[PDB]
Design an enzyme around this catalytic site. Structure first.
Site, PDB file in Angstrom:
ATOM      1  N   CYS A 120      -5.167  56.894   3.540  1.00  0.00           N
ATOM      2  CA  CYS A 120      -6.054  58.463   3.276  1.00  0.00           C
ATOM      3  C   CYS A 120      -7.748  58.221   3.041  1.00  0.00           C
ATOM      4  O   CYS A 120      -7.476  57.442   2.179  1.00  0.00           O
ATOM      5  CB  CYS A 120      -5.409  59.122   2.201  1.00  0.00           C
ATOM      6  SG  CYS A 120      -6.461  60.308   1.730  1.00  0.00           S
ATOM      7  N   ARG A 123      -9.886  60.734  -0.172  1.00  0.00           N
ATOM      8  CA  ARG A 123      -9.588  59.503  -1.106  1.00  0.00           C
ATOM      9  C   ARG A 123     -10.636  60.976  -2.221  1.00  0.00           C
ATOM     10  O   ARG A 123     -10.443  59.807  -3.516  1.00  0.00           O
ATOM     11  CB  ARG A 123      -9.202  58.851  -0.823  1.00  0.00           C
ATOM     12  CG  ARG A 123      -7.149  58.519  -1.126  1.00  0.00           C
ATOM     13  CD  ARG A 123      -6.700  56.859  -1.348  1.00  0.00           C
ATOM     14  NE  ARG A 123      -7.274  56.321   0.296  1.00  0.00           N
ATOM     15  CZ  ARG A 123      -7.052  54.815  -0.148  1.00  0.00           C
ATOM     16  NH1 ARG A 123      -6.728  53.939  -1.093  1.00  0.00           N
ATOM     17  NH2 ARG A 123      -8.440  54.466   1.348  1.00  0.00           N
ATOM     18  N   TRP A 292      -6.756  69.380   3.070  1.00  0.00           N
ATOM     19  CA  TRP A 292      -7.680  69.686   4.772  1.00  0.00           C
ATOM     20  C   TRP A 292      -7.641  69.215   5.687  1.00  0.00           C
ATOM     21  O   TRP A 292      -7.949  67.738   5.760  1.00  0.00           O
ATOM     22  CB  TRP A 292      -9.001  70.662   4.072  1.00  0.00           C
ATOM     23  CG  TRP A 292     -10.239  69.800   3.259  1.00  0.00           C
ATOM     24  CD1 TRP A 292     -10.428  68.839   4.074  1.00  0.00           C
ATOM     25  CD2 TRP A 292     -10.367  69.923   1.670  1.00  0.00           C
ATOM     26  NE1 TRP A 292     -11.809  68.761   3.029  1.00  0.00           N
ATOM     27  CE2 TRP A 292     -11.474  69.117   1.694  1.00  0.00           C
ATOM     28  CE3 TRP A 292      -9.705  70.946   0.911  1.00  0.00           C
ATOM     29  CZ2 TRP A 292     -11.955  68.074   0.654  1.00  0.00           C
ATOM     30  CZ3 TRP A 292     -10.039  69.660  -0.448  1.00  0.00           C
ATOM     31  CH2 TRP A 292     -11.743  69.116  -0.580  1.00  0.00           C
ATOM     32  N   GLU A 297      -7.952  64.931  13.446  1.00  0.00           N
ATOM     33  CA  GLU A 297      -6.881  64.563  13.237  1.00  0.00           C
ATOM     34  C   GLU A 297      -5.916  65.560  14.532  1.00  0.00           C
ATOM     35  O   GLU A 297      -5.118  65.416  15.237  1.00  0.00           O
ATOM     36  CB  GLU A 297      -6.127  65.241  12.135  1.00  0.00           C
ATOM     37  CG  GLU A 297      -6.802  64.356  11.307  1.00  0.00           C
ATOM     38  CD  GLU A 297      -6.442  64.618   9.719  1.00  0.00           C
ATOM     39  OE1 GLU A 297      -4.480  64.419   9.606  1.00  0.00           O
ATOM     40  OE2 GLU A 297      -7.009  65.444   8.884  1.00  0.00           O
TER      41      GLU A 297
HETATM   42  C1  HEM Z   1      -8.860  66.280   0.753  1.00  0.00           C
HETATM   43  C2  HEM Z   1      -8.792  66.149   2.124  1.00  0.00           C
HETATM   44  C3  HEM Z   1      -7.910  65.632   2.438  1.00  0.00           C
HETATM   45  C4  HEM Z   1      -8.101  64.517   4.064  1.00  0.00           C
HETATM   46  C5  HEM Z   1      -9.595  65.166   4.808  1.00  0.00           C
HETATM   47  C6  HEM Z   1      -6.879  63.386   4.433  1.00  0.00           C
HETATM   48  C7  HEM Z   1      -6.870  63.042   5.158  1.00  0.00           C
HETATM   49  C8  HEM Z   1      -6.454  61.927   6.004  1.00  0.00           C
HETATM   50  C9  HEM Z   1      -6.515  61.681   7.248  1.00  0.00           C
HETATM   51  C10 HEM Z   1      -6.958  61.598   7.842  1.00  0.00           C
HETATM   52  C11 HEM Z   1      -5.296  60.278   6.916  1.00  0.00           C
HETATM   53  C12 HEM Z   1      -4.408  59.943   8.568  1.00  0.00           C
HETATM   54  C13 HEM Z   1      -4.137  60.617   9.123  1.00  0.00           C
HETATM   55  C14 HEM Z   1      -2.883  60.744  10.684  1.00  0.00           C
HETATM   56  O1  HEM Z   1      -3.544  59.866  11.258  1.00  0.00           O
HETATM   57  O2  HEM Z   1      -1.555  60.969  10.252  1.00  0.00           O
HETATM   58  C15 HEM Z   1      -4.710  60.982   6.252  1.00  0.00           C
HETATM   59  C16 HEM Z   1      -3.486  60.643   5.718  1.00  0.00           C
HETATM   60  C17 HEM Z   1      -2.506  60.286   3.959  1.00  0.00           C
HETATM   61  N1  HEM Z   1      -3.301  60.631   2.853  1.00  0.00           N
HETATM   62 FE1  HEM Z   1      -4.670  62.398   3.177  1.00  0.00          FE
HETATM   63  N2  HEM Z   1      -6.243  62.896   3.315  1.00  0.00           N
HETATM   64  C18 HEM Z   1      -6.196  64.260   2.395  1.00  0.00           C
HETATM   65  C19 HEM Z   1      -5.838  64.472   1.350  1.00  0.00           C
HETATM   66  C20 HEM Z   1      -4.247  64.357   0.725  1.00  0.00           C
HETATM   67  C21 HEM Z   1      -3.973  64.865  -0.175  1.00  0.00           C
HETATM   68  C22 HEM Z   1      -4.381  66.476  -1.073  1.00  0.00           C
HETATM   69  C23 HEM Z   1      -2.940  63.826  -0.501  1.00  0.00           C
HETATM   70  C24 HEM Z   1      -1.369  63.222  -1.208  1.00  0.00           C
HETATM   71  C25 HEM Z   1      -2.127  63.622  -2.624  1.00  0.00           C
HETATM   72  C26 HEM Z   1      -3.395  63.206   0.534  1.00  0.00           C
HETATM   73  C27 HEM Z   1      -2.093  61.570   1.130  1.00  0.00           C
HETATM   74  C28 HEM Z   1      -2.715  60.706   2.164  1.00  0.00           C
HETATM   75  C29 HEM Z   1      -0.755  59.664   2.337  1.00  0.00           C
HETATM   76  C30 HEM Z   1       0.124  58.989   1.669  1.00  0.00           C
HETATM   77  C31 HEM Z   1      -1.348  60.075   3.845  1.00  0.00           C
HETATM   78  C32 HEM Z   1      -0.890  59.279   4.717  1.00  0.00           C
HETATM   79  C33 HEM Z   1      -0.300  59.560   6.071  1.00  0.00           C
HETATM   80  C34 HEM Z   1       1.492  58.773   6.477  1.00  0.00           C
HETATM   81  O3  HEM Z   1       1.339  57.341   6.237  1.00  0.00           O
HETATM   82  O4  HEM Z   1       1.364  58.890   7.919  1.00  0.00           O
HETATM   83  N3  HEM Z   1      -4.232  63.590   1.523  1.00  0.00           N
HETATM   84  N4  HEM Z   1      -5.069  61.833   5.322  1.00  0.00           N
HETATM   85  N1  LIG Z   2      -6.006  65.660   6.216  1.00  0.00           N
HETATM   86  C1  LIG Z   2      -4.699  65.909   5.799  1.00  0.00           C
HETATM   87  N2  LIG Z   2      -4.377  65.744   4.772  1.00  0.00           N
HETATM   88  N3  LIG Z   2      -4.135  65.151   6.612  1.00  0.00           N
HETATM   89  C2  LIG Z   2      -1.913  64.568   6.360  1.00  0.00           C
HETATM   90  C3  LIG Z   2      -1.564  64.392   8.140  1.00  0.00           C
HETATM   91  C4  LIG Z   2      -1.472  65.679   8.874  1.00  0.00           C
HETATM   92  C5  LIG Z   2      -1.324  65.114  10.008  1.00  0.00           C
HETATM   93  N4  LIG Z   2      -2.681  63.741  10.481  1.00  0.00           N
HETATM   94  C6  LIG Z   2      -1.542  65.925  10.980  1.00  0.00           C
HETATM   95  O1  LIG Z   2      -2.576  65.717  12.117  1.00  0.00           O
HETATM   96  O2  LIG Z   2      -1.044  67.288  11.398  1.00  0.00           O
END
Ligand code: HEM
Ligand SMILES: NC(=[NH2+])NCCC[C@H](N)C(=O)O
Ligand code: HEM
Ligand SMILES: NC(=[NH2+])NCCC[C@H](N)C(=O)O
Ligand SMILES: C[As](C)(=O)[O-]
Ligand SMILES: C[As](C)(=O)[O-]
Ligand SMILES: [Zn+2]
EC number: 1.14.13.39
Lengths: 416, 414
Positions: A120, A123, A292, A297
């Site tokens: 993520c 974070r 968000w 993505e």
């Molecule tokens: C606040 C805005 C957030 C942004 C911009 C963000 C952005 C991202 C991005 C760009 C990825 C990779 C997506 C992909 O390549 O499929 C990701 C993965 C992840 N995010 Fe965040 N994230 C956010 C919020 C959250 C929240 C609220 C949680 C959980 C409470 C979270 C948990 C994770 C996890 C666990 C992954 C790994 C997903 C996987 O392994 O397939 N994220 N996030």
């Molecule tokens: N900003 C996030 N919470 N991303 C979570 C993973 C979402 C995924 N990469 C999608 O395009 O649907």
């Protein structure tokens, strides 16, 4: 030098050591012989289902560790409250084969799991997470209500807010609470006669499961799928999301007037729902989370991946680019305009979104904060660096150490 | 256990059984992955105070000899057994041994083949190996280098080559080319902490001046070479301008691009890496092939710690440099890369774009799966710096390990 991994930022020439990796209690996929860092799903980031409760000793050690993490977070390590809680957990497990978290402990663990997510890039917001406690939920119908409430709060009419809804944990001798869908909002993927797919090729199996379960399919490219919610020991029940709840953004380009005519769109809320939330050895098999989107993505991965919408060629043709030769960089040019359109369309619709430059810049600030706070930050370089314009962002030039910390969000088998 | 590897674009699966041949350790452990680190002390081959113990050396040598004879299908012949005996006899009496030319040619090609961070490995079999082990002075090193350059450049129709200088010997200093590449641009520290030219070359520029080089003051001043014969101070050698083929950068449609005065050399010749074959280490073995456009347009010209021209170009394009959301950086980078491909094409110079390069790597991966049962690759280096997911390699899972012969990193001679 220090007995820990030396990390360098080549843009700044600065060095840091990661002492936090010393805290990791779960092994990853790599060995000194070979690096398996690029594998999406190695059997090391997955936690297989359980036909038997966790051995009271492994569960206990995990439980004790989490409790220690909790009290340390509130600064009462070694206190009487600390020892009493540890005792209560041991006693509880010694009789029931499991235990339960206090409300404040669940909120702590849920935020920590996000904080610990290597993949993520968002974070820096880890501290701001709305934790909806849904551990009282007792039916698929109620799951739907909680999910609908989550979507409304999180969407907030475009001004998105991070949130997660925690349904009952895994109980020995009882089925799991599962959301079959990979995300709360997803487009249908219809397998055609010629073999192709109308809609999202990624969602082909789930779409076919919804149909096998009574869903009357549409035939569009952007059909929002219904949910397949499953309460303990019961077959999954089908629920349709009220359209007014599902906010979507029609894509248009700031200059290319024809882009709007493509009929492209994307939903505003990214809500992963097939991941398992693990805290102190307790497994929450249903705990949808959302924040968000980061523009790449949608504009790069979702819309341009060869195995997804694959619209790169379509947009290139419209831009009148030489799609017959790689050296024209038609793919690069088209991708840039598609990402720009997603950014422009979300800003116009007043829906929250963050571009890849801003996202990475803030993750650098997050790394700095975590260096002082925990002495490191587990990060998966392949996933943190954006799918386009990689070395143009600061994270590319930043080396990273990747390891598993608990609490954590883990992958789990499909319920079917 | 053998890693199941998946291609997410095609759904295909392969099992890498070649990693089982790895005898050298990487930086990763089950507790944490260090795969994104550029220089671990593991891929490094530092100096030493004493000779490699006969047991370790003899085992690496026999393995290489075994690899060589298997390559020419004579595995098991009397020539094989006798070559093994020759190696044993020489190590037991001398603590070291020497390679036959044919073995050194096979070795160098295998080193390239095994290079995890190289996306140009489809060309691995086509390598001109110049044997320069009969070198005894820096002056000689210079002549050899000039010939490598003259051959490699070939008037713009570049050819992959490598010149192998004398191996390291336990009884003396190393033969070293101090420069990171045979051709590089100067980086002059300009009073106010800034740098005129290429910031990645500030140190070597200073060293050359330290050794009597009369420096220039442009952004693209080609640096002289600092060649070093064993236990001697390095010597300064200026490369003949006619040997250094450079390409002036211009854009196909943006007439003002040429006005930026940008340009880049045609030959990418890494000269600071150590080549290891059969336990023997060659501290000076410069190698060259041809550029992949992103190396110049994205990295060299756009990296914040390099030429950093992104903003300058954006301003010329009259882009919105106010905020990140206008994607001004992405747009600028795309044009710069395009200007690089157009320029090298307009000139007589060989170049490959990242889409062509990665497609070829996918073919190479397939070839290697059938040939050796796998292929060591470092995902972060194989995937280009811009448009990552727009290329096939991004969707390909990769296993990274150390195979020998190999190109390794080594300490800076100073
Ligand atoms: C606040 C805005 C957030 C942004 C911009 C963000 C952005 C991202 C991005 C760009 C990825 C990779 C997506 C992909 O390549 O499929 C990701 C993965 C992840 N995010 Fe965040 N994230 C956010 C919020 C959250 C929240 C609220 C949680 C959980 C409470 C979270 C948990 C994770 C996890 C666990 C992954 C790994 C997903 C996987 O392994 O397939 N994220 N996030
Ligand atoms: N900003 C996030 N919470 N991303 C979570 C993973 C979402 C995924 N990469 C999608 O395009 O649907
Ligand atoms: C034929 C054309 C070639 C192309 C297009 C090519 C391309 C590349 C690219 C893009 C990289 C990464 C460079 C970087 O990010 O700085 C690389 C690395 C490398 N290449 Fe190739 N290569 C070619 C020829 C060669 C040859 C002839 C050899 C050796 C005999 C070779 C050995 C390597 C090695 C060992 C690396 C690692 C460099 C490092 O660690 O800094 N390459 N190559
Ligand atoms: N194509 C090659 N052989 N490249 C070797 C490394 C060149 C280096 N990345 C440069 O930009 O100068
Ligand atoms: C839509 As066509 C230009
Ligand atoms: C070319 As404009 C400054
Ligand atoms: Zn690793």
């Amino acid at each position: 030098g220090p007995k820990f991994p030396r990390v360098k930022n080549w843009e700044l020439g600065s060095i840091t050591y990661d002492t936090l990796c010393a805290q990791s209690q779960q092994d990853g996929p790599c060995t000194p012989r070979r690096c398996l860092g690029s594998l999406v799903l190695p059997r090391k980031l997955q936690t297989r289902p359980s036909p038997g409760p966790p051995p009271a000793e492994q569960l206990l050690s995990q439980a004790r560790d989490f409790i220690n993490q909790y009290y340390s977070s509130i600064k009462r390590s070694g206190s009487q409250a600390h020892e009493e809680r540890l005792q209560e957990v041991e006693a509880e497990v010694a009789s029931t084969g499991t235990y339960h978290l206090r409300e404040s402990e669940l909120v702590f663990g849920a935020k920590q799991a996000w904080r610990n997510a290597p993949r993520c890039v968002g974070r820096i917001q880890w501290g701001k997470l709305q934790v909806f406690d849904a551990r009282d939920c007792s039916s698929a119908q109620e799951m739907f209500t909680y999910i609908c409430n989550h979507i409304k709060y999180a969407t907030n009419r475009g001004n998105l807010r991070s949130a997660i809804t925690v349904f009952p944990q895994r109980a020995p001798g009882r089925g799991d609470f599962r959301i079959w869908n990979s995300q709360l909002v997803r487009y249908a993927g219809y397998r055609q006669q010629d073999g192709s797919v109308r809609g999202d090729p990624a969602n082909v199996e789930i779409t076919e499961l919804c149909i096998q379960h009574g869903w009357t399919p549409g035939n569009g490219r952007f059909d929002v799928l219904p949910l397949l919610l499953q309460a303990p020991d019961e077959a999954p029940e089908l629920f349709v999301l009220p359209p007014e709840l599902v906010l979507e953004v029609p894509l248009e380009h700031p200059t290319l007037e024809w882009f709007a005519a493509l009929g492209l769109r994307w939903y505003a809320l990214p809500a992963v729902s097939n991941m398992l939330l693990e805290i102190g050895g307790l497994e929450f098999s249903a705990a949808p989370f959302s924040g968000w989107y980061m523009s790449t993505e949608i504009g790069t991965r979702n819309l341009c991946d060869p195995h997804r919408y694959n619209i790169l060629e379509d947009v290139a043709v419209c831009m009148d680019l030489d799609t017959r030769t790689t050296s024209s960089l038609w793919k690069d040019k088209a991708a840039v305009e598609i990402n720009l359109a997603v950014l422009h369309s979300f800003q116009l619709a007043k829906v929250t979104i963050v571009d890849h430059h801003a996202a990475t810049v803030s993750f650098m600030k997050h790394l700095d904060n975590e260096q002082k706070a925990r002495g490191g930050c587990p990060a998966d370089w392949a996933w943190i660096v954006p799918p386009i314009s990689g070395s143009l962002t600061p994270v590319f030039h930043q080396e990273m150490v990747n390891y598993i910390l608990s609490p954590a969000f883990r992958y789990q088998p499909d319920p079917w």
